[PDB]
Write a protein that binds this ligand. Structure first.
Ligand SMILES: OC[C@H]1O[C@H](O[C@H]2[C@@H](O)[C@H](O)[C@@H](CO)O[C@@H]2O)[C@@H](O)[C@@H](O)[C@@H]1O
Length: 101
């Protein structure tokens, strides 16, 4: 992971992370990744190893350089605040954001 060390000007809109990442040729590239493919809302908490959090969460934000923050519904249908460190699994490879397992 650790995209945040390779990238800057990052933003979250909905479930999409955008960022500008360094390229090996000396330049940079702007890219994006849909975090909804790789993050699950598990009883109100954002977790890896699943998908589709955006269906039952609201008010997504980037906190600091790498934290996804949101408000997500529990199984009992009430909202809690939750966060996950995108640096756990989101990497930058030659200027492009990629998920790494
Ligand atoms: O319904 C879509 C939802 O399914 C799964 O989440 C379950 C649970 O973890 C949630 O707390 C409640 C919230 O209503 O929904 C399900 O019971 C996950 O795959 C989740 O990412 C997805 O949004």
């Amino acid at each position: 992971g650790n995209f945040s060390q390779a990238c800057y000007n990052s933003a979250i809109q909905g479930s999409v992370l955008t960022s500008t990442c360094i390229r090996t040729n000396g330049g940079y590239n702007t890219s994006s990744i849909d975090l909804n493919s790789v993050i699950e809302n598990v009883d109100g908490s954002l977790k890896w190893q699943g998908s589709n959090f955006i269906e039952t969460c609201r008010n997504t934000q980037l906190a600091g350089s790498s934290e996804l923050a949101a408000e997500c519904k529990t199984r009992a249908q009430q909202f809690v605040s939750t966060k996950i460190n995108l640096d756990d699994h989101i990497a930058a490879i030659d200027g492009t954001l990629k998920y790494e397992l």
